Amino acid sequence: FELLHAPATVCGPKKSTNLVKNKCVNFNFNGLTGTGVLTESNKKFLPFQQFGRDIADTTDAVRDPQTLEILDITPCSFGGVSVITPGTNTSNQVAVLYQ
Amino acid sequence: FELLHAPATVCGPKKSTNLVKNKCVNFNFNGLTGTGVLTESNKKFLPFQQFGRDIADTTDAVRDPQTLEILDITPCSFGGVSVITPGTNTSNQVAVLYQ
Amino acid sequence: SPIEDLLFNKVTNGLTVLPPL
Amino acid sequence: KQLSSKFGAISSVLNDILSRLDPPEAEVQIDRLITGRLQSLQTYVTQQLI
Amino acid sequence: KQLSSKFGAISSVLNDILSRLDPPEAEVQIDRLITGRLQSLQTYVTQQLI
Amino acid sequence: SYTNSFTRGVYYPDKVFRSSVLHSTQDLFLPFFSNVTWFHAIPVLPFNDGVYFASTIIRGWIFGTTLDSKTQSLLIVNNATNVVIKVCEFQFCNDPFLDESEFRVYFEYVSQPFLKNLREFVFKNIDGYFKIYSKHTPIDLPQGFSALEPLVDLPIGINITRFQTLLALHAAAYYVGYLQPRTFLLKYNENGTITDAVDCALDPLSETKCTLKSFTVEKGIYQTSNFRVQPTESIVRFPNITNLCPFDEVFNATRFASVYAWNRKRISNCVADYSVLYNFAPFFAFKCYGVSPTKLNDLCFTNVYADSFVIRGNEVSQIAPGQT
Incomplete structure (x- = not known):
């Protein structure tokens, strides 16, 4: 093996996976790795x-190599949590609020 | 080595250059590289x-060890440029102001 | 006026100071 | 007066840094110089805003 | 409570680092500790001003 | 003949899609309102950066470094069937030409050919690669705006110094352009096509549009960048003392010292010569902090200190600031 002397080209065989739809994963599309849903693109x-x-400067759409179609990217649904509560001397019950 | 503010007694090999006045240039001497005009000083x-x-805490006066004479160090006129323009759908000419 | 004249007389890299309008 | 601050570097004059040291090490020298003068400028801008 | 922060170093005690490791690595540890305490003090000063 | 190119020569800097936004890029483009050498030959051309090409018949491009078999050279021949891009150590004539079944010029890449119209070609050579940009837009350059879509990439690795074109014997005329790195401001459309670009180094309205990230500006004052006055010459002055510092005494000695008996030599009041150090012996580590052993001819300071001792190899790394 001769290295550092030339732009490389004899790379190892990198495997490929199947398709996925409407489920946010840590997708790796031709070296572009990120987190987001895989929905049908109207673009x-x-x-x-x-x-x-x-x-x-965030990825919103990516194209798979196996199919000419394009899959939109939207990150997983985030949101803070809040606790609705009265004073502890009054009642022990609490309510969960999502933002 | 040491970079104390002392008379420099060991130099790298470079040739000397004749002085220029009232035209601001860049400069370097006894290991002091900077940009500024060279002129006779009242000091x-x-x-x-x-x-x-x-x-x-910069250099504003230097002595060339070629001939025992005093020199002045001062960068020339510098500033930011501003563009005085009217609205886009009014004209196309612009004005240049130097600060 | 003399009052504002007295008031004026009693008042005394890469950084520039922009003059006021 | 913050121009003469060494910021843990080798020399305070950036012309000396560029004309003395190799860019493999001048990279980290400029890194520490930029971050020191950058936080100094941030402090100055915050003081001016207040 | 900011004195008890490791700031990415081995410990949060200045006498502890200087008494068990060599001065070269202790220089980096003390530099990280002092710059972390510096940003802590600057944040406290900005909060005090606002 | 010289002819000004109005606004042509805009290509996609990357394969990233954008929809109705403004993207500032820092790559090698073709500046607007720049003269191009319109040839009318019926030799060899310099290559700084860019083989921006447009003709209204001719096929073929010579690429390489010294044009001979001493190094690798690139060949492109385009005909009606396919395109062959052969790179090897090929020998070339001073004025090669084609004929179309006979070759009078003396890994491959076979793909679709590159075929009034205007065949605009933009060539680039950076990071050991080779990029081709081409769109054939039908029509003094014509007044209009169009982009240059990318194509396949040819991994070569070597650098390109000189280039040459070919003449197809069945001629025509072609433009020759040159690129230098600058900043553009491309206005992508909703579908994802480049339709309008403005420069960043032009009349100051263009610089205002560059620094404001918008195409429409209003009245008022805008601070864009600086006008630091620029120098025109270099002034260097060193003392007129030539004593030839005794670096030979500390280097060319029979016995230097012991490890615990490292002696004292003080060299002063002379000029140093660091060009004689490399002629003595090949260096082992030669690492340096503080100063570099390349920019030692531009410094002048005082009171060097030279140490003499001998160590057994593995402790060379121990002779360093802060080692145990």
Whole structure:
């Protein structure tokens, strides 16, 4: 093996997985690894475009190599939690509020 | 080595260059590299000093060891440029203001 | 006026000071 | 007066740093110089805002 | 309570680091501790001002 | 012949899709309102950066470093069937030309060919790669705006110094452009096509549009960047003393010292010569902190200190600031 002398090209065989739809995973699309849902895209791409972005420099759409279709990216639903409670001298019950 | 403010007695091999006045250039001497105009100074040096200083802890006066004469160090006029323009759908000419 | 004249007379890299409008 | 602060570097003059040391080590020298003068500028901007 | 923070170092005691490790690594540990306490003091000063 | 290119020569900097946003990029593009060398030949051309090409017949491009078999050279021949991109140590003539079944010029990549119209070609050579940008837009350059879509990438690795074109014998004329790195501001459309680009180094309205990240500006004052006056020449002055510092005494000695008996030599009041150190012996580690052993001809300071001792190899790394 001769290294550090030339742009490399004899790379190892990297395996591929199956398709997924409407479930946010840590997808790895041709080296682009991120977290987000995989939904059907209403957008229209171009043959020389791989993945998209937005104003906030975040990935919103990616294209799988196995199919000419495009899959939108939206991160998993986040939100803080809050506890509705009276004074502890009054009652022991609490209520859970999601933001 | 040591970089104390002392008369420099060991130098790298470089050739000398004739002085220029009233045209601000860049400069380097006795290991002191900077940018500024070279001119005759109203200041005077005792015959043991090499370079002067200022409030900003920088170099504003230097002595060339070629000929025992005093030189002045001062960067020339500098500032930010501003663009004075009207609205886009009014005209196309612009004005340039130097601060 | 003399009052504001007296008031004026009693009042005394890469950083620049922009002059007021 | 913060221009003469060493910030844990080798020399305070950035011209000397660029004309003396290799960019493999001048990278981290400029790194510490930028972060020190950057937090100094942040403190100055906060004081000016207040 | 900010004195009891490791700040990514081995410990949070200045006398402990200087009495068991060599001065080269202790220099980095003391530098990280002092800059962490510096940002803590700057945050406290900004909060006091606001 | 010289002819100004109005606004053409805009290509996609990356394969990233964007919808109705503004993206500031820092790559090698073609500046607006720049003269290009319109040729009318019926030699060899310099290559700094960019083989921006557009003709309105000719096929073929010579790429390489020294044009001969001493190093690797690149060949591109395009005909009606396919395209062959052969790279090897190939020998080339001074003025090669084609004929179409005979070759008079003297890994491959076979794909779709690159075929009034205007075949605009943008070539790049960075990071050991080779990129081709081409869209054929039908029509003094014509007034309009269009992009250049990317194509396949050719991993080569070597650098490109000189280039040459080919003449197809069945001629025509072509533009030759040059690129330098600057900043663009591309306005992507909703579908994802580049339709308008403005520079960042032009008349100051363009710089205001660059620094404001918008295409429409209103009246008022805008501070964009600085006007630091620029120098025109370098002034260097060192003392007129030439005493040839005794680096030979501390280096060329029969016995230096012991480890515990490291002696004292003081060298002063002279000029150093660091070009004679490399001629003595090959260095083992030669690592340096504080200063670099390349920029030692531009420094002048005082009171060097030279130490002499001998150690048994594994303790070379122990002779360092702060080692046990």
